[PDB]
Design an enzyme around this catalytic site. Structure first.
Site, PDB file in Angstrom:
ATOM      1  N   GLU A  65       0.846  -1.183   0.000  1.00  0.00           N
ATOM      2  CA  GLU A  65       0.000   0.000   0.000  1.00  0.00           C
ATOM      3  C   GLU A  65       0.882   1.233   0.000  1.00  0.00           C
ATOM      4  O   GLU A  65       2.016   1.201   0.479  1.00  0.00           O
ATOM      5  CB  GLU A  65      -0.916  -0.004   1.237  1.00  0.00           C
ATOM      6  CG  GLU A  65      -1.858   1.173   1.381  1.00  0.00           C
ATOM      7  CD  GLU A  65      -2.807   1.322   0.199  1.00  0.00           C
ATOM      8  OE1 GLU A  65      -3.868   0.654   0.173  1.00  0.00           O
ATOM      9  OE2 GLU A  65      -2.477   2.120  -0.714  1.00  0.00           O
ATOM     10  N   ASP A  93      -2.249  -5.047   0.957  1.00  0.00           N
ATOM     11  CA  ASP A  93      -1.629  -3.916   1.638  1.00  0.00           C
ATOM     12  C   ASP A  93      -0.219  -4.203   2.132  1.00  0.00           C
ATOM     13  O   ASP A  93       0.602  -3.276   2.191  1.00  0.00           O
ATOM     14  CB  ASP A  93      -2.476  -3.484   2.838  1.00  0.00           C
ATOM     15  CG  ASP A  93      -3.777  -2.816   2.431  1.00  0.00           C
ATOM     16  OD1 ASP A  93      -3.741  -1.818   1.697  1.00  0.00           O
ATOM     17  OD2 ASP A  93      -4.842  -3.307   2.850  1.00  0.00           O
ATOM     18  N   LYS A 119     -15.286  -7.873   2.687  1.00  0.00           N
ATOM     19  CA  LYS A 119     -13.910  -7.850   2.195  1.00  0.00           C
ATOM     20  C   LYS A 119     -13.457  -9.225   1.716  1.00  0.00           C
ATOM     21  O   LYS A 119     -12.622  -9.317   0.809  1.00  0.00           O
ATOM     22  CB  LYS A 119     -12.967  -7.321   3.277  1.00  0.00           C
ATOM     23  CG  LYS A 119     -11.518  -7.200   2.818  1.00  0.00           C
ATOM     24  CD  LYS A 119     -11.217  -5.825   2.204  1.00  0.00           C
ATOM     25  CE  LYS A 119     -11.644  -4.688   3.122  1.00  0.00           C
ATOM     26  NZ  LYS A 119     -10.801  -3.468   2.987  1.00  0.00           N
TER      27      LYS A 119
HETATM   28  O1  9HD Z   1       8.864   6.818  11.303  1.00  0.00           O
HETATM   29  C1  9HD Z   1       7.866   7.521  11.157  1.00  0.00           C
HETATM   30  C2  9HD Z   1       7.040   8.152  12.258  1.00  0.00           C
HETATM   31  C3  9HD Z   1       5.820   8.674  11.542  1.00  0.00           C
HETATM   32  C4  9HD Z   1       6.307   8.908  10.119  1.00  0.00           C
HETATM   33  N1  9HD Z   1       7.338   7.899   9.981  1.00  0.00           N
HETATM   34  C5  9HD Z   1       7.772   7.395   8.682  1.00  0.00           C
HETATM   35  C6  9HD Z   1       7.927   5.880   8.623  1.00  0.00           C
HETATM   36  C7  9HD Z   1       6.677   5.109   8.151  1.00  0.00           C
HETATM   37  C8  9HD Z   1       6.263   5.364   6.688  1.00  0.00           C
HETATM   38  C9  9HD Z   1       7.021   4.650   5.544  1.00  0.00           C
HETATM   39  C10 9HD Z   1       7.042   5.430   4.209  1.00  0.00           C
HETATM   40  C11 9HD Z   1       7.623   4.888   2.877  1.00  0.00           C
HETATM   41  C12 9HD Z   1       8.967   4.133   2.960  1.00  0.00           C
HETATM   42  C13 9HD Z   1      10.125   4.864   2.300  1.00  0.00           C
HETATM   43  N2  9HD Z   1       9.983   4.959   0.853  1.00  0.00           N
HETATM   44  C14 9HD Z   1      10.442   3.918  -0.051  1.00  0.00           C
HETATM   45  C15 9HD Z   1       9.744   4.280  -1.354  1.00  0.00           C
HETATM   46  C16 9HD Z   1       9.558   5.772  -1.253  1.00  0.00           C
HETATM   47  C17 9HD Z   1       9.442   6.006   0.235  1.00  0.00           C
HETATM   48  O2  9HD Z   1       8.966   6.989   0.798  1.00  0.00           O
HETATM   49  N3  9HD Z   1       6.630   4.256   1.977  1.00  0.00           N
HETATM   50  C18 9HD Z   1       5.698   5.076   1.212  1.00  0.00           C
HETATM   51  C19 9HD Z   1       4.727   4.057   0.621  1.00  0.00           C
HETATM   52  C20 9HD Z   1       5.529   2.794   0.554  1.00  0.00           C
HETATM   53  C21 9HD Z   1       6.489   2.946   1.707  1.00  0.00           C
HETATM   54  O3  9HD Z   1       7.089   2.041   2.281  1.00  0.00           O
HETATM   55  N4  9HD Z   1       8.334   4.109   5.960  1.00  0.00           N
HETATM   56  C22 9HD Z   1       8.493   2.709   6.340  1.00  0.00           C
HETATM   57  C23 9HD Z   1       9.992   2.482   6.192  1.00  0.00           C
HETATM   58  C24 9HD Z   1      10.587   3.837   6.465  1.00  0.00           C
HETATM   59  C25 9HD Z   1       9.494   4.791   6.042  1.00  0.00           C
HETATM   60  O4  9HD Z   1       9.611   5.995   5.823  1.00  0.00           O
HETATM   61  N5  9HD Z   1       5.576   5.239   9.135  1.00  0.00           N
HETATM   62  C26 9HD Z   1       5.461   4.296  10.242  1.00  0.00           C
HETATM   63  C27 9HD Z   1       4.539   5.012  11.222  1.00  0.00           C
HETATM   64  C28 9HD Z   1       3.696   5.892  10.341  1.00  0.00           C
HETATM   65  C29 9HD Z   1       4.589   6.159   9.151  1.00  0.00           C
HETATM   66  O5  9HD Z   1       4.449   7.054   8.321  1.00  0.00           O
HETATM   67  O1  KU0 Z   2      -5.697  -0.683  -1.728  1.00  0.00           O
HETATM   68  C1  KU0 Z   2      -6.858  -0.365  -1.963  1.00  0.00           C
HETATM   69  N1  KU0 Z   2      -7.290  -0.029  -3.174  1.00  0.00           N
HETATM   70  C2  KU0 Z   2      -6.456  -0.124  -4.361  1.00  0.00           C
HETATM   71  C3  KU0 Z   2      -6.093  -1.550  -4.732  1.00  0.00           C
HETATM   72  S1  KU0 Z   2      -7.477  -2.476  -5.349  1.00  0.00           S
HETATM   73  O2  KU0 Z   2      -6.983  -3.694  -5.930  1.00  0.00           O
HETATM   74  O3  KU0 Z   2      -8.258  -1.603  -6.177  1.00  0.00           O
HETATM   75  C4  KU0 Z   2      -8.432  -2.909  -3.927  1.00  0.00           C
HETATM   76  C5  KU0 Z   2      -9.800  -2.697  -3.923  1.00  0.00           C
HETATM   77  C6  KU0 Z   2     -10.540  -3.048  -2.806  1.00  0.00           C
HETATM   78  C7  KU0 Z   2      -9.924  -3.617  -1.713  1.00  0.00           C
HETATM   79  C8  KU0 Z   2      -8.566  -3.835  -1.724  1.00  0.00           C
HETATM   80  C9  KU0 Z   2      -7.811  -3.486  -2.832  1.00  0.00           C
HETATM   81  C10 KU0 Z   2      -7.915  -0.358  -0.886  1.00  0.00           C
HETATM   82  N2  KU0 Z   2      -9.088   0.191  -1.224  1.00  0.00           N
HETATM   83  C11 KU0 Z   2     -10.084   0.217  -0.334  1.00  0.00           C
HETATM   84  C12 KU0 Z   2     -11.383   0.862  -0.764  1.00  0.00           C
HETATM   85  C13 KU0 Z   2     -12.300  -0.008  -1.640  1.00  0.00           C
HETATM   86  C14 KU0 Z   2     -11.831   0.331  -3.049  1.00  0.00           C
HETATM   87  C15 KU0 Z   2     -11.715   1.835  -2.983  1.00  0.00           C
HETATM   88  N3  KU0 Z   2     -11.174   2.049  -1.630  1.00  0.00           N
HETATM   89  C16 KU0 Z   2     -10.564   3.183  -1.259  1.00  0.00           C
HETATM   90  O4  KU0 Z   2     -10.480   4.141  -2.025  1.00  0.00           O
HETATM   91  C17 KU0 Z   2      -9.909   3.219   0.089  1.00  0.00           C
HETATM   92  C18 KU0 Z   2     -10.630   3.264   1.284  1.00  0.00           C
HETATM   93 CL1  KU0 Z   2     -12.353   3.311   1.277  1.00  0.00          CL
HETATM   94  C19 KU0 Z   2      -9.953   3.275   2.495  1.00  0.00           C
HETATM   95  N4  KU0 Z   2      -8.626   3.238   2.570  1.00  0.00           N
HETATM   96  C20 KU0 Z   2      -7.922   3.187   1.443  1.00  0.00           C
HETATM   97  C21 KU0 Z   2      -8.517   3.169   0.189  1.00  0.00           C
HETATM   98 CL2  KU0 Z   2      -7.533   3.112  -1.227  1.00  0.00          CL
HETATM   99  N5  KU0 Z   2      -9.915  -0.282   0.929  1.00  0.00           N
HETATM  100  C22 KU0 Z   2      -8.717  -0.845   1.317  1.00  0.00           C
HETATM  101  O5  KU0 Z   2      -8.607  -1.294   2.468  1.00  0.00           O
HETATM  102  C23 KU0 Z   2      -7.698  -0.879   0.360  1.00  0.00           C
HETATM  103  O6  KU0 Z   2      -6.540  -1.434   0.745  1.00  0.00           O
HETATM  104 MN    MN Z   3      -6.743  -2.297   2.845  1.00  0.00          MN
HETATM  105 MN    MN Z   4      -4.702  -1.315  -0.120  1.00  0.00          MN
END
Ligand code: 9HD
Ligand code: KU0
Ligand code: MN
Ligand code: MN
Length: 178
Positions: A65, A93, A119
């Site tokens: 996700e 996710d 779900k």
């Molecule tokens: O430590 C903290 C305290 C609150 C904010 N924060 C950042 C760490 C992560 C987010 C993610 C973000 C990130 C990871 C880093 N990357 C890699 C791709 C681009 C990017 O932003 N993403 C974005 C979507 C996919 C993914 O894994 N995390 C988890 C790993 C460290 C981190 O920042 N996190 C965990 C608590 C909430 C939250 O945001």
């Molecule tokens: O990942 C998701 N969607 C993209 C991949 S999918 O294959 O289309 C996909 C579609 C449905 C379920 C899982 C994957 C995902 N979607 C939902 C719901 C229903 C679809 C639209 N929707 C939202 O907009 C939404 C909401 Cl209501 C709350 N929180 C995040 C999101 Cl995005 N709920 C999730 O829990 C979630 O994981």
């Molecule tokens: Mn979900």
């Molecule tokens: Mn999702």
């Protein structure tokens, strides 16, 4: 047209969550300035997904996700072609490297049982874990993956989001929106 819910979302969630939620809604063709309840729900789901992935050991979870659709799917095939798991029909996710399964996280404001059922029908092998805004949870085969303290902190945070909305009188509109 700028709502109170929109400003509350941006003050409640961290800027990286917000920006990620905005990017996802633009992709579905939706507007955070209008569908503001969905804006808040997507941020919440996102934060829960991130807190969850932080609950285990160091690199236990793969975060699927929060990526763009194409890259999220690319990481799904690599996981599948490395583990032997079958490809889910819908994007999950997370992936659990320890238990070797995909996780679908759910956050609902209605009763946990109702949402779990819906779900399920929308992937037999993917593990499902639902959290409520009231503090309930339900996971597939009663296997909650994380220990109690990590799940408890997620539930606390969810109930705090609920209070912050009610204090601003946005909860009931948010609850009846789902
Ligand atoms: O430590 C903290 C305290 C609150 C904010 N924060 C950042 C760490 C992560 C987010 C993610 C973000 C990130 C990871 C880093 N990357 C890699 C791709 C681009 C990017 O932003 N993403 C974005 C979507 C996919 C993914 O894994 N995390 C988890 C790993 C460290 C981190 O920042 N996190 C965990 C608590 C909430 C939250 O945001
Ligand atoms: O990942 C998701 N969607 C993209 C991949 S999918 O294959 O289309 C996909 C579609 C449905 C379920 C899982 C994957 C995902 N979607 C939902 C719901 C229903 C679809 C639209 N929707 C939202 O907009 C939404 C909401 Cl209501 C709350 N929180 C995040 C999101 Cl995005 N709920 C999730 O829990 C979630 O994981
Ligand atoms: Mn979900
Ligand atoms: Mn999702």
């Amino acid at each position: 047209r700028g709502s109170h819910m929109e400003d509350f979302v941006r003050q409640c969630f961290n800027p990286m969550i917000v920006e990620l939620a905005e990017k996802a809604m633009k992709e579905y063709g939706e507007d955070p300035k209008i569908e503001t309840n969905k804006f808040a729900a997507i941020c919440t789901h996102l934060e829960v997904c991130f807190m969850y992935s932080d609950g285990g050991s160091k690199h236990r979870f793969e975060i699927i996700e929060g990526r763009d659709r194409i890259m999220a799917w690319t990481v799904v095939n690599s996981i599948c072609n490395t583990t032997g798991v079958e490809k889910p029909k819908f994007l999950p996710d997370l992936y659990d490297y320890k238990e070797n399964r995909f996780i679908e996280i759910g956050v609902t404001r209605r009763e946990v049982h109702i949402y779990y059922l819906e779900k399920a029908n929308k992937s037999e092998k993917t593990h499902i874990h639902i959290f409520s805004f009231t503090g309930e949870e339900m996971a597939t085969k009663a296997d909650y993956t994380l220990d109690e303290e990590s799940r408890a902190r997620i539930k606390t945070r969810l109930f705090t989001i609920r209070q912050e909305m009610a204090s601003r009188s946005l909860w009931d509109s948010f609850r009846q929106s789902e």
